[PDB]
Each structure stands twice: as C-alpha cells, then as structure tokens.
Symmetry: C4
Subunit: 283 residues, 4 copies
C-alpha cells in the first residue's frame, strides 16, 4: 500500500528544547531561505498582489497565477517588489514568484528581477514540460525555476535532468481519471534522489491541517504549498480572517510538533523524526 498523511503519526522522542528556541527556517535554494516554510498556491482565488506581500512579510512566499496574462501579470509581481524578518533579496525588495504556462513569456517577468518562476501543471513528467525547463534555463540561466508536478522518483530525476532547481510533488483528478499517488509515499519516493541531487522539495497537495505540514516536512520536504486554506481571508481577492493569524497557527503547530520529537531546527527534525503506522481505527 502507498501511504498518505492520515496513515502515520510522529513518534515522541526525548526533548530538551521549548517551542521558543525552535527554528523553522528552511533553505530552498542556494541563496534562498524562508523563515516560514510555506508557499502560496497559484490560484486566482488565492495568491494575488496583496496575498503575495502578506506571504513574503510573514516569512514565506507567494507565487502569482497564470490566469492574469503575460503583461497584466507583471503588474502584480512588480507591486510586490515595491515595498520585521521578512524574506527579501540582497536588494531589500520582498521575494515573490510567478506561475508560468507551456514560446515562453518569462522575459517580462525576469526584467522585474523575478525571484522564481513556477512551471507547474497536472503532469510534470511531460515532454513539453521537460523542454519548457531547459528552455528557461537556456534563456535566463541565473533565474531559478520550480517544476511540477511529479509523484515519482523517475519524474523527479527527469525534471532535475532538465535543470529544475526545485521540484513540486502532487481530488477531482482521482475521480475523473483514476490517476494519483498518496502524498506521503510520493514525497518519500522523490526525496531519496533529491537529497543526493541537492534539490529541495515543495509538497503541493494533501495539506489539511498543521499536522500534515509537520509530516510533510519530517518526510523530507523543505517547504509545503498551500492554497485552499488561504482562500477565505482578507488579503485574498467561507471566511478565514487575517493571513498572519492562519500562518501563525501553522507555525505554532509545526513548532510544537518539533518539540515533541526534540528538534530545534528542520535539519535535525528530518534526522530524528520517526513515523508510527496507525490502524484504520485512527480517530
């Protein structure tokens, strides 16, 4: 059987730290570190110009969706770079990413010094998706690209071979097509090669609570991508309230789970985390 998040629990280990000295910083790329290991999804109802700023200012990052345009989209990302310990570049302008489709229109995004461009679709192990990655690194080599989605160690190596710096893993698609893979097994399948290729992992899908974020990060993911749980908010274009209240609930939940396993940072979190397999009577 392939495991999902509800199939396992984190085993409590000896601890000598408190959720006060606990670091949740994650290093996704070479010169790219998030204080909050959370990315916003590329949906029209989620990450806009306002939510992208709220994500960067809270310690994370948001990516701008493709259903604006090429150029009506660059108006959204350039606003983010107009503006505590937020995540911003050497220039001091807040980090931000943008979702792209599969000739490419990344020039107008790179000219605004985009921090990341996201080539994401339903099937990351495609050939037109594979050649879209080499197309972007051939034109803009210094630019960093995240590719997805893939649920296999084979698809991860294909995207890594194409030059992807980060990969994305990950329902109506299960019902309409019958295609899918439980997220926990998919995450663990693609990180044993990604940890040897030096490539970070963004888990996209299956995140319902903050406990699922703890399991995804403990499985080997450097960051999680969240969309539906950031939809009914003020900063987004059901009702959630302020964005900083939602993310603080996730940050606090992730910090408390690390205190259960006795980890002060994410590196040792993934080194001592142990999954207990629970029965169907998991309530």
């Amino acid at each position: 059987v392939a495991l999902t998040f509800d199939d396992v629990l984190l085993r409590p280990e000896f601890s000598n730290v408190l959720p006060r000295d606990i670091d949740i910083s994650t290093r996704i790329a070479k010169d790219f570190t998030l204080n909050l290991p959370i990315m916003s999804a590329a949906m029209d109802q989620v990450t806009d110009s306002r939510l992208a700023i709220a994500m960067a200012q809270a310690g994370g990052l948001g990516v701008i969706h493709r259903n604006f345009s090429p150029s009506e989209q660059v108006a959204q990302v350039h606003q983010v770079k107009k503006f505590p310990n937020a995540t911003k570049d050497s220039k001091g302008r807040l980090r931000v990413a943008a979702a792209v489709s599969v000739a490419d229109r990344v020039g107008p995004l790179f000219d605004v010094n985009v921090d990341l461009v996201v080539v994401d679709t339903a099937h990351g192990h495609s050939q037109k998706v594979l050649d879209a990655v080499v197309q972007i690194k051939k034109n803009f080599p210094s630019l960093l690209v995240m590719a997805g989605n893939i649920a296999t160690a084979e698809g991860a190596l294909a995207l890594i071979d194409a030059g992807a710096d980060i990969i994305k893993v990950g329902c109506t698609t299960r019902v309409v097509t019958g295609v899918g893979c439980p997220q926990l097994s998919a995450i663990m399948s693609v990180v044993e090669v990604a940890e040897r290729a030096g490539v970070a992992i963004v888990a996209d899908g299956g995140i319902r609570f903050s406990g699922d974020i703890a399991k995804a990060i403990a499985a080997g993911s450097a960051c999680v991508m969240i969309g539906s749980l950031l939809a009914g908010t003020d900063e987004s274009p059901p009702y959630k309230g302020p964005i900083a209240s939602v993310l603080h609930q996730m940050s606090g939940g992730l910090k408390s789970s690390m205190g259960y396993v006795g980890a002060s940072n994410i590196e040792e979190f993934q080194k001592k985390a142990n999954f207990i397999r629970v029965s169907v009577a998991g309530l």
Copy 2:
C-alpha cells in the same frame, strides 16, 4: 485481498502524448470496432431506439432489451437499423436474449450482436444456449455472461462465445460476488489466449473507473445506471452526448497521464498503485 476499482490508482508515467491524438477505439470482434469503448447495459429503464441510436451515433453500442416482448424487441431492432455503421452502412446495434428460438427473428433484422445475458453465466443452461445459437447462426456474434472466474470464462469460450462479459443487491441477498477489478484480471489471460474481448459490466460510477477497467484488460465498458436519467432513455442527467463525452474525456486524460496513444499501449503501460484505507 480481492481488489475493486477504489483500491487502486493509475501511476503517472512519462508522457509525450496530448489528448488530441488519443485513439480510444477498440475491437470487440472480427470486423467490429467501436470508436467509443462504451456499451449501454440491458436495463429496461435505459436502452431502446432513442438510446441505442444515440449510443451508435456516438461511436459505442446499445443492447435493446428482452424485457420487451419478442415481437416488440425485433420491431425496435428494426427502428435502429433504419437510420457504429456496419458493412452496409446501417447503424449497428445489439439485442439481449435469455436461456434461442427467439434469436431467429433477430437474425432477420441483421442484428450485429446477440447477448446471452444472465446473472450466472457459468451454468449449464447458458452453456447449452450459446452452443445452440452458434449451431443455427454461426455467422452471428455472441456475447455471453456474466462470469467472474477464469474457469467460467473458459467454459463460455469453449461453448463458442465470441465476447465475454464480466460482472449491490446480489451481495446482500445471496452473499455471492467478486470485486470487479480482480474479476477482470482473472479473466484476461484466458480471454487473450483465445482472442476473445472482455466487456466490463458493473461497478462503474466515474470516468476513472472506465479507465481502470480498460487498463486492467477490458476491451469495453458496459454502463447502465449512468445512462438511465438521460433524455434518450425511457434523477435526470440530460443529453446522452454530454455524459458520453465526459467519459471519453476522462479516459483520454488518464491515458495521457500514463503516456499511451491508444488502448493497447494503455494496457501495456498501466501500473496500479495499491492505496490504503485512509488514502481516499
């Protein structure tokens, strides 16, 4: 340990295909090819002229029922045969019979397929029925069912069946049954060795179930409840061209997920992922 459709998931493979050159056509017998691998079940609340002509115009096939009295059954096999496509350009259709004299009038409307439809195909009365049909009408294609074992499949094949149909209230009343995914897989090797197509009958609710059944070895899928509320039928689904286009759209999408251009590549490339009880 016996798997149904909901116990598995198709694993995504590397793909260079896009749902524009995807061939969902399939053969069910010699000189019998359906552009849509979907047949309409033999429910008297489903298949008649309005639905059989619609199933045939969409690229599939319909089975006009035997709940009709015998003279009204052939009178509706006549209604479909006069305006997919046979040798003479007539819209192909099928008809169901029970356990052989009533098949004579069905041959003289030049029906394209006769379905010996019962709930327990692995029985002597069905074996004797298939032998009697191929004796008086050997140029007549016979689909027989329903079975769910390799032994029942070989018994029908040995009796002269050209197509095997594999197939709840029967589970509650009798306690007898078999999960469809395991039933399909237990029959394919006996059917592929004999060159006999398999029609998956029952357990289909979504378009993903059609993709799993075909990937498991089925040459065609027979749906009934999902075509009951349609207009071309005697809830309310609406136009039958829209529900059928959704089925083919979902099948083409999953075949693109595994990287298959046609159905034969689909059945050779597909790999099933066993999913846990919580993985739903």
Copy 3:
C-alpha cells in the same frame, strides 16, 4: 485478524442446479430435521407461542424465551404443541424449543413434551453451564440439549464433553466488556471440532440479511438463529418497526439461500458446505 460475514464473499462456481429444486433441509440432531434452517431467538420481543407456531409451520423452529416465568414458559410450550413442511414430532404435533438458564424449568418442560431444551447463556464456556448440561442429561437422557454460547474450539470441546447435543456459536456486550469474537471466524474455529464429534452447530448473531445466512451455513453451521429480523412481525409479541407477516420474511430468507446455493452449484446443504469457497473482500469492496 478474525473475520466477520462482511469480510468475505461466496465465489461463483459451475452450476447445473435450478433454484426451484434446491433442498435446504438440515439435520440438527438425530430424528430432528428442519425444512427451514432458521431458528427464532429466545428474546421476549421475538418468540412466544404465536411465533413459535409460525416458525414451526414454516419448517423452522422456535425457542420460547425465559423471561417468561417457569409456569408461563410451560404454558407457552403447551400452546404450541396443541395447535405441509411443518416441523412436527412423531405424533404429528408442532415442535418447539425452550430456553432455560443456569431445576424449576426442565422437569415441567420435559412433561409437556418439549422437543429441545436450550441452555442459553452469554458465556457457555463456564463451570455453571457444564454442570447444568451434565445434570440435565443425567436426569433426562432422552431430552435433546443445545448449549451456548461459545466462540472458541476449546469451548466447543467442553460442551460436547459435557454431553451437549447441539452447540450454539455466538453489539452491547462488545462495548460494555470488550469481549467478543467475529462470527465468521468463530464458526470456522468450531466446525472442525464439532463435526468430528457429530454435533451440529447453530450460528447465533451477526445475521443482517439472507446473504449472511448463506455464509454462515456455507461456513459449516447447520442452522442459523435470528432475533431482531423477526421482531416487527405479526406473530411477534406486542402491537407495534412493523415488518408484516412472518411467512414473507422467512420466504425471503429461504429464497436468498436457494439463490446463493444456485450460484455455488449445490442442491443441498451438504454439497453447499463442500463446494463453497470464500473470497476475502477489501475495505472498499462494499
């Protein structure tokens, strides 16, 4: 793990038997044959004299409950034995069973010619039940005794060694005590020990539909006992979920059992228990 009825399915087999000419009769004891392999439970909402007569008329058997006083229970047995394929004794009277607990009942029940005494207890594998079975057979050797309930092989051996002619295999007790055993595994764990001793088995509990009766019988039990499925009928006590005539409820159960044996290609219960194969179904295989 231990499996229940919903964990398995009967596999279809080759069949040349038509469901009309299928014999579902069973021999629960020497010179004791039921044309309907169904017994009514000893519950005060199920089996009085009116339902026991209806159970006996349909070819089954009724077990007068012991919530009746000992004098009331004797009067209810008398009303049954004074009233086509009906369960009748050698003198042509309808047969009936009577439930006793673990002196003031067996004697009076024996002289009103009760056909079977049922030592009904939630835990048949106990010293009290073994003493009761021994004392009943010591004083009334010509009286058939069914003991229960047990769920293990060692429990079945204790009742057989105590002299029980029939053993009964069998939720609030699960939640209150945490004790229990899935009925399918309990039946299978007992039938190899029981049939070696020539003792029939009555499956008691877990029967929701006629398909469960087929599985229990195919697993090895000679007869099933149902309770709540007969609670809302006319012959059931009270004046009330109303279920209608008991004959149609029992006709539905016998119809599903005959249709099930047709899928397996069996003509009688012995062939059913020899041809039947179980297919283990997954959690999603509802």
Copy 4:
C-alpha cells in the same frame, strides 16, 4: 501497525467465577491500593473537591486540577482530607491527588497531606519534566509522584530513573502536531519496563466505554484515568450534557469490568492480566 482499543477484542476463556466475587482492587504504589481502578483526570470541568470526594468514596481517586491558583488548589485538597470501600489513608481520611506543571505548589500541598503529586504535562519525556521529578523526590522523599504523559518504553525508563513511583501513559494533538501513539500499543510498550522496575501504569486517554477500561487493564494497566465521561455528573463542576450521579457512572464501568473478567475467568486484576488474550478484528468488524 500500532493498535488502539477498537482494534482488538478480549477472547472468551473458561471461567468458574461469578462477577459477584470478582476483586477489581489494584495496587498503584506501596501502601496505596484502590478498590476501584479509576482515577479522575486533572481537568477543570472534572475534578473538583466535590468530585474528588465522590471518587475516593467509591474506591477510586481524584486528581485536583491545576487551573486553580496554587492557594485554591491547596484549599480544594484541604476540603477532601477533612471530609465502605472508600480509599483512605492511615488516619482514616479520604485520599486525593493534585497536579503540578513543572515550586509554589508541592510544598503547600505536602503540608495539607496530599496523597499523590501528579507531574502532568503533554510530553513527559523532556528535560523539564525529569528535573521536576528529581527535585520533588529530593525535598519530599516520602511523597509519591506520578509522572506523564509518555508513550514509549524509552520515555518510561527516563521517568522511572528520575524517581517517579507511577507512570502515566498517553485528540487535538494528532491534527495540530501530527504526533501521537495508539493507546493500546503505547500501554503494551511500557508494561515490560514498568514491571521490571516495580512501578504501576496509569492509562490516560482513548477510553470511551467500560470495555476500553477492561482492555487497558488487561494490557497491563494498574489503573485508568477518565475525564470526559465524568464531566457532566452531579459532583462535577458546572450548573444545570448532564450525566447524573457519578456513583451510577462508576457503578456501570465497575460492572462492565467485572463481567469482562468473568468472560476471561479471572477473579482479580493479576489473573486478568495473565489470562487475557486479544483477538485482532477486521476493519469490517467495527
């Protein structure tokens, strides 16, 4: 996989004891035995001084919660000590426990003759908890200490080596943090270490009925800690889900445990923990 209470069932064994003469007393420490193996949790909606008095009078024990101020908690303990099978100390006064959370409590609570100090926290396998245990044992060596909660054999030995006389094993945790352990496997993972160390185990969490209490004790627990099941009682804090008199609630689970030991054929808790066999049940069995 790791099993919870709903994953297993107790197997029926041969029995020669009636639940009338079944001894459910348990020993949690030296010169500290409870006639009812039940302890009320340290929750503000559960254990008052009134509820703790009702717990000690029924044969159990109460753990005064620590959402009281330290002065309030000392007054609640005073009211219990100054107030049949009741759990009393050498001076004939009702016994009571009190919870602390890792300086201004243990002293004053020792002065009012508290019978047990409970170091209660969500993660007992931590340095702050181990330091709290060793310092209570340093200043108050004659004071019994229960520490928790843990769920592993490793975390159990850390508490025992720190000086804990009783170990506590054990919602919102699994969804907020993704951390947890099924209670049945957690209890069975500690009994080996605790038995060789001579310390008793208190099962805290996952108990919904009296059957879970029997399974927890059969798995090796000396006592269980229930909370929500006593929250809406007469003696519980609040005013008027109302559940009624707590003596009737405790009478129900006391009867459920006794009959569960009758199925296994045990007259005391020790025989219950040796004769008990667990049956793994299917997903369809629940």
